[PDB]
Amino acid sequence: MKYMITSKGDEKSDLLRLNMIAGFGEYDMEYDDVEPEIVISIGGDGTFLSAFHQYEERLDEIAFIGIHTGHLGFYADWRPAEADKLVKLLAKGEYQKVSYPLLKTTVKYGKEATYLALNESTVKSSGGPFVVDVVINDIHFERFRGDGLCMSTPSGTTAYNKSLGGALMHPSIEAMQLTEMASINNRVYRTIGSPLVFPKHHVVSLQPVNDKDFQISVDHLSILHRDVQEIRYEVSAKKIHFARFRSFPFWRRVHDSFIED
Amino acid sequence: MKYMITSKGDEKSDLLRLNMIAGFGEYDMEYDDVEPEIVISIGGDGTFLSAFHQYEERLDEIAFIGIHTGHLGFYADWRPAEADKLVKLLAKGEYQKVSYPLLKTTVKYGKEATYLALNESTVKSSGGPFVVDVVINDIHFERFRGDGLCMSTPSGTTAYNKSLGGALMHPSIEAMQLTEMASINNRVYRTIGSPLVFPKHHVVSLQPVNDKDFQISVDHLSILHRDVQEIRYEVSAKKIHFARFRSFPFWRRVHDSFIED
Amino acid sequence: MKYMITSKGDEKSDLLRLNMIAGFGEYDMEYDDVEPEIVISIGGDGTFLSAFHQYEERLDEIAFIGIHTGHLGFYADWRPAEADKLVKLLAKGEYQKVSYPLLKTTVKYGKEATYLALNESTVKSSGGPFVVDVVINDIHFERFRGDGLCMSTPSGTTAYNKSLGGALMHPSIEAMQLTEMASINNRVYRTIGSPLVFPKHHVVSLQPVNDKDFQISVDHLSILHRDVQEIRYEVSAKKIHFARFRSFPFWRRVHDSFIED
Amino acid sequence: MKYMITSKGDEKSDLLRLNMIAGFGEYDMEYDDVEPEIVISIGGDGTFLSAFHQYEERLDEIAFIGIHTGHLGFYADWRPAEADKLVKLLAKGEYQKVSYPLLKTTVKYGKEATYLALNESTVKSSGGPFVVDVVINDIHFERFRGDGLCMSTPSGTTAYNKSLGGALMHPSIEAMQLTEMASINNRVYRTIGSPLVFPKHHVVSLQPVNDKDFQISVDHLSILHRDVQEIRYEVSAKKIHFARFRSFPFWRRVHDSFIED
Ligand SMILES: C#CCCCn1c(Br)nc2c(N)ncnc21
Ligand SMILES: C#CCCCn1c(Br)nc2c(N)ncnc21
Ligand SMILES: C#CCCCn1c(Br)nc2c(N)ncnc21
Ligand SMILES: C#CCCCn1c(Br)nc2c(N)ncnc21
């Protein structure tokens, strides 16, 4: 079928890409980076993230694969020494697919802008103090003062979510997790402190109190949005699909990355 | 139908219990504490927990209700001023039920003992050092040294789980969460640190390294088990069912208990 | 003697300032905001911080006093209802002085810039990743990857230091405390995680690895420094002196602000 | 002078001890374990702790030395390959001494019992709930509910203190640090959460609310004390003295143990 390969652009990744294309030429496989059904990422998790966002249009028509030419990654989880075996079973088709949930971020102005995130989306202030009211399913939950907030996908919990004390979540759980960044807690102000895990269809809304300008990140991308009226988080109806050629459990992936490998 | 009422045993709880029984006498309602289908708890969450464990036999035949005569609780979430309205709609039946997941704990010796937990189950050492190997779905994940571990139900995440830095989890998520107690982390030993959230059918197994005696707690109950070979945690196939007479969202319950009420 | 009064600029603070000046006119007291020996701050801790930095020149010639017209502050710790009693004992002189330590921050380029901080000084990246090597007393201690670092004075430990998990430190301890912001810890990278408390004469040096542009804050002030070669932290030889008219222990001040008042 | 050597009792430690005694026989050195002025510990930090408590009587008459036959320790910080060079410079005398602060723990009943701790002292409940009022310098600071509390010496901050989120403190700072274990924080109850660092002469007193039986630990030793009226912590007037034969900075010791070695 159709396929494309993105590369980190260093020496080993470009050469591994050319070898897989050459190997792909020995099968009923066509290179098309416009409407591929198999996107192969070569490099790191950042290379995978760029591949994911490049094709966020046709998510339900693509199965992704990540190859790590550096250290092990949670998305680029196949060693380069596995490329030739990868080439063959991709071309013979008839492989299993696994799907991970995604996080929808809606930004509303005084207009609307929506975004899809594979790792997480964060909100910080444009320089001054960051104060927002946190509204869960239309109920006002808390007034947050601090550096910012982070809403994470399940598979995103091993990234920035982990650095803020959030929990690690198996990606088969359709959920999103919200964590705090350096929150102020005293006798006047109060935050929950604990990370919060939300199921499907629960809507978390951030609403400004004074400053209406926020630095909003979605995975690697980060833009200052002006005159923001609301930020809305919820588990996405869309999922990312992976090609599954071997058993590599999420908890083993977590172990190899943090305990020992 | 059949029903029973348990009470904390102070003055207000006993008197509120006698008033509800008297109010119940005005309907087609029979007091039976052997095979009730409605268990009403009056007191605190601890009173509710005792009620839950008293009838862990016929869980799929009981709808629980908690009334708090003290501060608000996550299970005893109906004010005493609501007892008379509670009496009427319980007797007229035709109410909605909601179900929360439970945590199964299997203890194996050199024999087997299983337990059901509504909040959490914890493991500590019998005095000396606590060292266990943590095995997730037969894969060895880590060797834990510290004070102990805690596996929490979703609704249990607001209790002991919360005090250890775990995340708060909406009880509609069929999951369990494992947290660490004062873990040793150095150049020799390594723990994940982060709390871990497990879905249904994932089995977490604790296995001793040297000391085979552990203090194991299940909700309020705590017993020293001797010559333990394995502790096994997994989300239970059984659920606890609540009678639902009004909208009281879990996040509002969390807000009222920790932010302000 | 000479004195000046700074005000937050709202209605109550300006009026309380004019009342104290009028009360001061009944004594041997001269208003001079160029070479005062008593600086009175009216407003919040932020008002006090501006007063401190306005006169960082003649620190060993000034005794500061803070009055809070809002909530209680750690520097503005005298209620407005105490202004008239404040006026009298300030003019009669013969009061006790107490001194708190300060933090010296040296910035070196490819030139040198030094700063004094009453609360803390923080370092973040100019947008990209923040990576620095941490050098303690010329010994390379760690390579830090994360959002940033924070070095706090003793009295500064109740501010930003507290929000990052640092310890609260009695201001009679001549020390500085370094805390981490959302550090990445895996199998490749390693940080201490724990906050570190440094005594007098211990020099902590931050050195860039790739990006040489950092956003450096000193109390309220925050500037992007370009082509930074080194950031150097150490306990200052200068101290800030307070006028002491009553017993108000630091731990009571901490209690009133965080537990209950 | 007089000296003694304690050993962990395995094969290498006993043999290294006999070699040092034999090496000591070639100098003006006498083995006396009753009134030694040089106590040499061979094994781990636990071996050192037993040596410290064995001679807590004549602390101001002893210089301690620790040799690690296992991994590096914060007190047993000299490799076994250094024993013969150790023997010579110990016998030639004329070495430098360094001193670390200690923590005094006073227990009062309805009688008095005092203890000296090199690492830390902890308080937990005898089984039921642990509730104590925390009194700082006679001022009531907080009512603590949780698993327990831990007061740590400076050098003790790398042990249990570190596992609870406390800060690492250079041992030249005459201080003590108090940390919380799994504290309950809600709308009814309030703890500071943050670790607290206390200077010399600040007295921290724990006072029971209901249960008057506590499990109190002092370094390795742990005893259930009955009918406790008060627990009192303060920096000790006594210090432990080390023999200093080389530069081994505390921060390098911290680095080697937690970052890499
Ligand atoms: C090291 C480093 C920087 C972050 C790498 N990274 C990315 Br990108 N996505 C990640 C993920 N989902 N889980 C863990 N790590 C991730
Ligand atoms: C205050 C106090 C002691 C714990 C009360 N408690 C119990 Br019992 N179950 C609880 C729960 N599920 N969520 C929150 N709190 C809970
Ligand atoms: C509320 C709020 C914002 C921070 C106020 N604040 C300032 Br400014 N200095 C502070 C200090 N030293 N200790 C505690 N709080 C402080
Ligand atoms: C590994 C392990 C168990 C604790 C060892 N240990 C002891 Br004993 N005292 C210690 C200390 N002061 N700093 C760090 N570690 C210490």
Alpha-carbon distance C118 to C104, whole Å?
Answer: 9
DSSP string, chain B: -EEEEEE-SSHHHHHHHHHHHHHHTTSS-EE-SSS-SEEEEEESHHHHHHHHHHT-TTGGG-EEEEEESSS--SSS-B-GGGHHHHHHHHHT---EEEEEEEEEEEEEE--EEEEEESSEEEEEESSS-EEEEEEETTEEEEEEEESEEEEE-SGGGGTHHHHTTPPEE-TTS-EEEEEEES---SSS-----S-EEEETT--EEEEESS---EEEEETTEEEEE-SEEEEEEEEEEEEEEEEE-S---HHHHHHHHHT--
- Are C218 and C75 in contact by the 8 Å Cβ rule? The answer is no
**DSSP label of A59:** G
**DSSP label of C6:** E
Q: Provide the token pair at B220.
A: 């309020």
Strands D228-244, D96-109: pairing kind: antiparallel
- Are A179 and A89 in contact by the 8 Å Cβ rule? The answer is no
- Are C226 and C108 in contact by the 8 Å Cβ rule? The answer is no
Q: Could you tell me which residues come within 8 angstroms of residue D230 by beta carbon, excluding any fewer than 6 positions away?
A: D106, D107, D108, D205, D206, D207
- A206 to chain B, minimum CA–CA distance in Å? 15
Hey, whose CA ends up nearest to atom 10 of ligand 3?
Answer: C159
Alpha-carbon distance B37 to D67, whole Å?
Answer: 68
- Are D168 and D254 in contact by the 8 Å Cβ rule? The answer is yes
Count how many pairs of residues, chain A against chain C, have C-beta atoms within 8 Å.
45
Q: Which chain C residue has the Cα nearest residue D259?
A: C190
What is the torsional sign of CA C231, C234, C236, C237? negative
Rg (CA), chain D: 20
B138 touches chain A (CB under 8 A): no
Burial class of C247 by CB neighbour count within 10 A (0 to 12, 13 to 18, 19+): exposed
DSSP lists the bridge partners of residue C243 as C97
**DSSP label of A143:** E
- Are B260 and A185 in contact by the 8 Å Cβ rule? The answer is no
Least CB–CB distance from A190: residue in B167, B199, B260: B260
Rg (CA), chain A: 20
Q: Which chain A residue has the Cα nearest residue C187?
A: A258
Alpha-carbon distance A96 to B235, whole Å?
Answer: 27
Alpha-carbon distance B165 to D146, whole Å?
Answer: 13
Nearest Cα to D168, choosing from A166, C216, C142? C142
B165 touches chain A (CB under 8 A): yes
- Would the annotation count B160 as a binding residue? yes
Chains contacting B (3 or more CB pairs within 8 Å) = A, D
D163 touches chain C (CB under 8 A): no
Nearest Cα to C213, choosing from C104, C105, C109? C109
Strand arrangement, sheet containing A168-169: A168-169, B196-199, B175-181, B148-152, B120-125, B214-218, B221-225
- Are A68 and A44 in contact by the 8 Å Cβ rule? The answer is yes
Residue whose structure tokens are 């319950």: B253
Least CB–CB distance from A260: residue in B136, B175, B190: B190
CA angle B192, B195, B201 (to 5 degrees): 100
The dihedral formed by the CA atoms of A39, A45, A51 and A56, expressed in degrees to the nearest 10: 100
Strands B175-181, B204-208: pairing kind: unpaired
Q: Which chain B residue has the Cα nearest residue D187?
A: B258
Q: Could you tell me which residues come within 8 angstroms of residue C57 by beta carbon, excluding any fewer than 6 positions away?
A: none
Q: What are phi and psi of D54, to 5 degrees?
A: -65, -30
Distances (CA, A) of B77 to B21, B54, B247, D133, D186: 20, 20, 11, 29, 16
- B133 to chain A, minimum CA–CA distance in Å? 13
Q: Could you tell me which residues come within 8 angstroms of residue B229 by beta carbon, excluding any fewer than 6 positions away?
A: B108, B109, B110, B207, B208, B212
Nearest Cα to C121, choosing from C173, C158, C160, C147? C160
- Are A160 and A120 in contact by the 8 Å Cβ rule? The answer is yes
Q: Amino acid letter at B207? A: Q
Hey, whose CA ends up nearest to atom 11 of ligand 4?
Answer: D159
Of the bound ligands, which one is closest to the alpha carbon of residue B66? Answer: 2
Length of chain C in terms of residues written: 261
What is the torsional sign of CA C99, C101, C102, C104? positive
- Are D39 and D67 in contact by the 8 Å Cβ rule? The answer is no
Least CB–CB distance from A199: residue in B173, B194, B198: B173
CB atoms inside a 10 Å sphere around CB D193: 17
Largest Cα span, chain A: 69
C141 touches chain D (CB under 8 A): yes
Alpha-carbon distance B7 to A71, whole Å?
Answer: 59
Nearest Cα to D52, choosing from D155, D150, D149, D126? D155
CB atoms inside a 10 Å sphere around CB A260: 9
Contact between chains at A195 and B254 (C-beta distance less than 8 A): no
Which residues in chain A are closer than 8 Å to B136, comparing Cβ atoms?
Answer: 251
Alpha-carbon distance B207 to A55, whole Å?
Answer: 45
B137 touches chain A (CB under 8 A): yes
Alpha-carbon distance C5 to A253, whole Å?
Answer: 61
Rg (CA), chain C: 20
Strands D38-43, D2-7: pairing kind: parallel
Mutant choice from D194, D205, D260 vs C, greatest count of C C-beta within 10 A? D194
Q: Is D45 a catalytic residue?
A: yes
D188 touches chain C (CB under 8 A): no
Least CB–CB distance from B258: residue in A167, A173, A192: A192
- Are A117 and A156 in contact by the 8 Å Cβ rule? The answer is yes
Q: What are phi and psi of D20, to 5 degrees?
A: -70, -40
Domains of chain C with bracketed CATH: 1-101+238-261 (no CATH), 102-237 (2.60.200.30)
Residues of A forming the annotated binding site?
A: 45-46, 119-120, 145, 147, 155, 158-163, 220
C227: left (phi over 0), alpha (psi -120 to 50) or beta: left
Q: In whole angstroms, what separates CA A90 from the centre of its chain?
A: 24
Q: Provide the token pair at D68.
A: 């690690």
Nearest Cα to A237, choosing from A151, A174, A168? A174
Is the CB of D36 inside a 6 Å radius of any atom of ligand 4?
no
Q: In whole angstroms, what separates CA D247 from the centre of its chain?
A: 21
- Are A217 and A122 in contact by the 8 Å Cβ rule? The answer is yes
Q: Could you tell me which residues come within 8 angstroms of residue D253 by beta carbon, excluding any fewer than 6 positions away?
A: D72, D74, D77
Q: Provide the token pair at A165.
A: 């004390």
Is the CB of C120 inside a 6 Å radius of any atom of ligand 3?
no
The dihedral formed by the CA atoms of C55, C60, C63 and C68, expressed in degrees to the nearest 10: 50
3-state SS assignment for residue A127: coil
Of the bound ligands, which one is closest to the alpha carbon of residue D76? Answer: 4
Nearest Cα to D44, choosing from D243, D259, D257, D217? D257
Contact between chains at C187 and A71 (C-beta distance less than 8 A): yes
SS (HEC) of chain D: CEEEEEECCCHHHHHHHHHHHHHHCCCCCEECCCCCCEEEEEECHHHHHHHHHHCCCCHHHCEEEEEECCCCCCCCCECHHHHHHHHHHHHCCCCEEEEEEEEEEEEEECCEEEEEECCEEEEEECCCCEEEEEEECCEEEEEEEECEEEEECCHHHHCHHHHCCCCEECCCCCEEEEEEECCCCCCCCCCCCCCEEEECCCCEEEEECCCCCEEEEECCEEEEECCEEEEEEEEEEEEEEEEECCCCCHHHHHHHHHCCC
DSSP lists the bridge partners of residue D67 as D42, D78
Q: Which chain C residue has the Cα nearest residue A166?
A: C182
Closest atom of ligand 2 relative to the B155 alpha carbon: 12
The helix (run of H) or strand (run of E) holding residue A204 is: strand A204-208
User: What approach was used to elucidate this structure?
Assistant: X-ray
Q: Could you tell me which residues come within 8 angstroms of residue C231 by beta carbon, excluding any fewer than 6 positions away?
A: C105, C106, C107, C108, C123, C132, C205, C206, C207, C214, C216
Q: Could you tell me which residues come within 8 angstroms of residue B128 by beta carbon, excluding any fewer than 6 positions away?
A: B211
Which residues in chain A are closer than 8 Å to B137, comparing Cβ atoms?
Answer: 249, 251
CB atoms inside a 10 Å sphere around CB C167: 27
Nearest Cα to D148, choosing from D210, D205, D215, D234? D215
Kindly give the distance from the C-alpha atom of residue A256 to the centroid of ligand 1, in angstroms, as a whole number: 13
CB atoms inside a 10 Å sphere around CB C142: 23
Of the bound ligands, which one is closest to the alpha carbon of residue B258? Answer: 2
CB atoms inside a 10 Å sphere around CB B127: 11
Alpha-carbon distance B209 to B226, whole Å?
Answer: 14
Q: Provide the token pair at D253.
A: 């010791």
What is the torsional sign of CA D192, D194, D200, D203? positive
CA angle D157, D162, D168 (to 5 degrees): 50
Peptide-bond breaks in chain D following residues (C–N over 2.5 A): 110
CA angle A169, A175, A180 (to 5 degrees): 75
C27-66: b or e for each residue (b if 16 or more CB lie within 10 Å)?
Answer: eebeeeeeebebbbbbbbbebbbbbbbebeeebeebbbbb
Distances (CA, A) of B18 to B24, B95, C203: 10, 23, 71
The helix (run of H) or strand (run of E) holding residue C2 is: strand C2-7
Q: Which chain C residue has the Cα nearest residue D189?
A: C259
Hey, whose CA ends up nearest to atom 4 of ligand 3?
Answer: C159
Q: Could you tell me which residues come within 8 angstroms of residue A143 by beta carbon, excluding any fewer than 6 positions away?
A: A131, A132, A133, A134, A189, A190, A209
B128 touches chain D (CB under 8 A): no
Which residues in chain A are closer than 8 Å to C261, comparing Cβ atoms?
Answer: 187
3-state SS assignment for residue A248: coil
Q: What are phi and psi of C127, to 5 degrees?
A: 145, -55
Alpha-carbon distance A18 to C249, whole Å?
Answer: 71
Alpha-carbon distance A47 to A7, whole Å?
Answer: 7
Strands C2-7, C30-31: pairing kind: parallel
Strands A63-68, A148-152: pairing kind: unpaired
Is the CB of A121 inside a 6 Å radius of any atom of ligand 1?
no
3-state SS assignment for residue C114: strand
Of the bound ligands, which one is closest to the alpha carbon of residue D47? Answer: 4
Distances (CA, A) of B261 to B71, B160, B163, D187, D261: 10, 21, 20, 8, 52
Alpha-carbon distance A204 to A201, whole Å?
Answer: 10
Alpha-carbon distance B169 to D132, whole Å?
Answer: 30
Q: Return the best residue to mutate from B8, B45, B118 for the ligand 2 pocket (most ligand atoms within 8 A of CB).
A: B45
C186-224: b or e for each residue (b if 16 or more CB lie within 10 Å)?
Answer: eeeebbbbbbbbbbeebebbbbbeeeeebbbbbbeeeee
B198 touches chain A (CB under 8 A): yes
Kindly give the distance from the C-alpha atom of residue C129 to the centroid of ligand 1, in angstroms, as a whole number: 13
Nearest Cα to C180, choosing from C234, C141, C122? C122
Peptide-bond breaks in chain B following residues (C–N over 2.5 A): 110
Is the CB of A159 inside a 6 Å radius of any atom of ligand 1?
yes
Chains contacting A (3 or more CB pairs within 8 Å) = B, C
Q: What are phi and psi of C118, to 5 degrees?
A: -90, -35
Alpha-carbon distance D195 to D44, whole Å?
Answer: 28
Peptide-bond breaks in chain C following residues (C–N over 2.5 A): 110
CA angle B49, B54, B57 (to 5 degrees): 115
- C7 to chain D, minimum CA–CA distance in Å? 31
Q: What are phi and psi of C175, to 5 degrees?
A: -155, 175
Is the CB of C70 inside a 6 Å radius of any atom of ligand 3?
no
Nearest Cα to A175, choosing from A192, A205, A151, A209? A151
Residue whose structure tokens are 């912001």: C181
Hey, whose CA ends up nearest to atom 16 of ligand 2?
Answer: B159
Alpha-carbon distance A182 to C164, whole Å?
Answer: 6
Name the B residues in 202-241 with CB < 8 Å from any A CB: 202
Q: Could you tell me which residues come within 8 angstroms of residue C110 by beta carbon, excluding any fewer than 6 positions away?
A: C227, C229
Is the CB of A6 inside a 6 Å radius of any atom of ligand 1?
no
Strands A168-169, A139-146: pairing kind: unpaired
